[PDB]
Design a protein around this nucleic acid. Sequence first.
RNA 1: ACCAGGAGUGGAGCCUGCGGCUUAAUUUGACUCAACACGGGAAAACUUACCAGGUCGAACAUAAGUGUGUAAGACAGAUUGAUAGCUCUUUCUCGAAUCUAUGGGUGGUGGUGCAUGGCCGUUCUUAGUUCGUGGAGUGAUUUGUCUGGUUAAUUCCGAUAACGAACGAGACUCAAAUAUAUUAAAUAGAUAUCUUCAGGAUUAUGGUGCUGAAGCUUAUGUAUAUGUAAGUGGAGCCGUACCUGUUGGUUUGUCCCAUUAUAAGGACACUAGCUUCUUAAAUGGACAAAUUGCGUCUAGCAAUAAUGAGAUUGAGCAAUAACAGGUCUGUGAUGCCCUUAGAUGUCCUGGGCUGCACGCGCGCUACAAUGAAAGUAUCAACGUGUAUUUCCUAGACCGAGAGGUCCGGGUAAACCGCUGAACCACUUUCAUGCUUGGGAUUGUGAACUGAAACUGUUCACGAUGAACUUGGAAUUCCCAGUAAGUGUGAGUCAUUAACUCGCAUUGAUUACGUCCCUGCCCUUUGUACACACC
Lengths: 52, 102, 74, 227, 132
Amino acid sequence: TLWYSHPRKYGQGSRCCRACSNRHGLIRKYGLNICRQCFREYANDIGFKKLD
Amino acid sequence: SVHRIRITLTSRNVRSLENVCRDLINGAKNQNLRVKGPVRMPTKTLRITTRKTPCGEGSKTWDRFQMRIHKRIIDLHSPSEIVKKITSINIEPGVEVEVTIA
Amino acid sequence: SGGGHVAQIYAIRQAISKALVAFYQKYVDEASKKEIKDILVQYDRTLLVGDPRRCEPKKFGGPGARARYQKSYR
Amino acid sequence: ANLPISKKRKFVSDGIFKAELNEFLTRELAEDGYSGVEVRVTPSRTEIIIMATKTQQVLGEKGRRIRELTAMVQKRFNFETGRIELYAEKVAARGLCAIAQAESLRYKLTGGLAVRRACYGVLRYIMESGAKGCEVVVSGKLRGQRAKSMKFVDGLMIHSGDPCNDYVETATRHVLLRQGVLGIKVKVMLPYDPKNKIGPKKPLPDNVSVVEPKEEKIYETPETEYK
Amino acid sequence: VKDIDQHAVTKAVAVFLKKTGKLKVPDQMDIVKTAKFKELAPYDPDWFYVRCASILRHLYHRSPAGVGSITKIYGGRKRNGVHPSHFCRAADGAARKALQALEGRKLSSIGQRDLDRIANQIVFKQRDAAKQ
RNA sequence: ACCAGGAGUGGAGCCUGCGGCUUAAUUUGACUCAACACGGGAAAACUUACCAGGUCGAACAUAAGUGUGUAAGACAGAUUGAUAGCUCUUUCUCGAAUCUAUGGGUGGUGGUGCAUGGCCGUUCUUAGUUCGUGGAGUGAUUUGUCUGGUUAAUUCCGAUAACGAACGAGACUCAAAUAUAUUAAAUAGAUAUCUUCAGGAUUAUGGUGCUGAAGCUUAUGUAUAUGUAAGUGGAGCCGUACCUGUUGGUUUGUCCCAUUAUAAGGACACUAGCUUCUUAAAUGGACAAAUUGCGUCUAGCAAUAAUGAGAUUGAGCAAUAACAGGUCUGUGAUGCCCUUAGAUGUCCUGGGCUGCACGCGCGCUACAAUGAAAGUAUCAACGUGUAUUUCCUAGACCGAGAGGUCCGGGUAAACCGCUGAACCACUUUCAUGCUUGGGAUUGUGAACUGAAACUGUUCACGAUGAACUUGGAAUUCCCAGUAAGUGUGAGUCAUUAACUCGCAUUGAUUACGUCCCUGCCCUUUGUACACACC
């Protein structure tokens, strides 16, 4: 209610980090939301074998 | 009167995508379900690249990652009274059947 | 389709060359197939040398495939 | 439930789904030795086959731990109560999967720096369960202040190629040391062919086996009766 | 129409409707720069409605073609804003009212055999003109 | 790493990396190679860790009011940035978690990468590591791992002094060339013909042709077109088929039928559209006795044999011992230390990270005649796109524009879209004149995104035209669909790309080596070499 600003619906803030709650390091715009320093540990089991 | 139920099938593993033409389509063409053969689709490849390294300081290249999921479509010129049993058998891990009702 | 303002005109040559070679194989005459080949193959201007030279995947550190921008203070 | 979601976003939402189920299950069933999950999304029911070792405690009183499993995700993902069925299956060849063996090393390293009786015995049973190659390392502080990295190899670890894209099985374990920290990384190399091996892959990467040439009766006399 | 390329033919047709009173002159025609990239106004107006010859191939092969699908892909050789160049929409405006200059749905209903065959008779006459 | 070169940058403009400067604070990490368009770092605030004002409360037994209100909230005027009953002049109030001084735990983008883990980079465009048997030797450790041949290769041969050693490299993983020869289409359709959209006389003309045809105007009805006459004018008119073109279906074709209409059932071509193509799901695929005065019989370059194919062919994966490399600010990985109602935490209001006499690096904008202009011709592809959040867009409409409105499509080989991309190519306009080249600067309104813009949100219009004509010493990358030009998409996104990840088009000179120089890989080799010439 009081003392809670930021109508978040524009930009990054605050639609951030469905994997680590770390707002600065997100990769989002496919549907991943993995906070890609939390991707190499979390690459399996979500597909994504390397091929070249 | 007669229905044309066109059913998409997809999976990631091509071997299961090769498994389904071994068992499903011949259990229906034995009784004239009008499969019209394996309707393979182009796949949906996706490549994501980023910094592979937390604190990526040095020779600062990237890591590539790939994904391939392939589709193969089975349409049939047969009504609804025949096609409920093929939805029960055979079922495979990671295959997706989509039959429209309403 | 495809090609461009140069390379699309190229593929006419392979089409117009082999159009005679298959109509002469199965429909007209063996020596008619033979008389259209020996005139070509003297130097042939790659009318049938379909080199599969294609665009190569790109790499990192460059603006091109086999390029790399550099001088990180040598 | 049913969404108008794109199929490429349908497929990745499946991958992010199973990326969370293993999290608390490693957090909870590390003592029972959880290894694996197989998920199939069937019509009218979603079947999830969890692979765990100590199956006599994954159940609880009148299915107390069983109904604990269904209590997890039907409020986490808020899906329909009735489609979700979870079952923890006893793994076959517990010394062969060995990822729970790495997990129990945390339960083995609480004996006060027993590299001889326990960590040297880690490499015993995986050879007693018959691997051609295996690996453990210890990376962290041992015997004092400065950290020391020691290797424990026994076998044939190739580090490269599609057999190494298929034969190995990774396991990274951060166990909290009394002083500060310990990371544990184990690797295994498995005999994919011989025993039953219906679905590891049962391949052969390069090993060309050549059969007996079957020497022949070169004369081949008639001895012909006319029946 | 499937005769010789309309480098000269598009010059020809732009005067022919200009001869028959169907000019239908624009209002800011000395002001317009046909896009937010250009730095000089054009010399005249006849080059504007030359794209009836395009829709003799674009209604023929592409589609019954709207205004937005036309002008964005139309007229691109563009050097945009200086650091660095991009690609833009060419900013049609008043040429979406060029159907009044000609008088599931179709854009020009008279250019099927009534209007375009006369232009095809012109290139057939230009075949006789270029015959010597 | 050169040479033979090429394009460059280092000059100019500008944008950012960072120092320096300064500031309330201009948060900060990282110093060769391997910090320097990196922490995806393209930040108004948020992020943010920075600075300046504020702000929350969080355990426990103890314990003492008693429930004669321990509290908790607003008006009111101060305080405010707003209302913050945060405070409070003054008012009623659900009052009970008994709101405790006390255990202490909680939290942190606090400290430390000289506490580590994990991860990554280099050591790695090379060719090396290391174990069970022995004979070397008092031991260190050597032998194995070679004198040679050859290899990208510790790659094999052969000497052969463990071999049966084991990895590494090979090998396997991916990517368009490859018989549709086999089943395969809401991709695409080849086609075939049905057609319809029909010029021409390319055709044959039948009616017709100077008799007024074709064409031309006026009048008004109908709601201006058309009708007609007059007007009008002096050769053509109208119809067919051939030619060349829209369209619609040709799915087991036609006519059947059930059906509202597909199929067969009924017959015919007996195929009145089939699978070339895109798509593979597969085997195929230079699959190498490939011919060659055989080299230490062993791997005689030879291009040459094929005729999709003289590798279709590029990355990914990468050891051993390690280094005080990188990070505790990726993290509810985390030791230790720091703090805890007066917070570093946390949420609000702000600023700032963008501040500028200065150093620098990474790139784009040009320095114009292989052009700047105008049009015209007319070409891709990876991809891309909205369900619980407003994406992709088309279609009409308005507007110098920017953009605005209306009806749509598309959760997607399906709609955007067959995305009908730029540079080129084609007539011109310019006369080389810091010039119409080059667009920094700076006003101005016009936009628009977002609650909100001001070394800036970007975009419009019409003004403004600097610097700079090839860039000192220097120094970058690179041998084919490559360099390089020239673009699109993706990524960060409400709006902001000049970078970043691949896509695609256009398409060179020159090398087809050498061991000088900076390099690097282990064989003999002197040494005082050691923390290894720093």
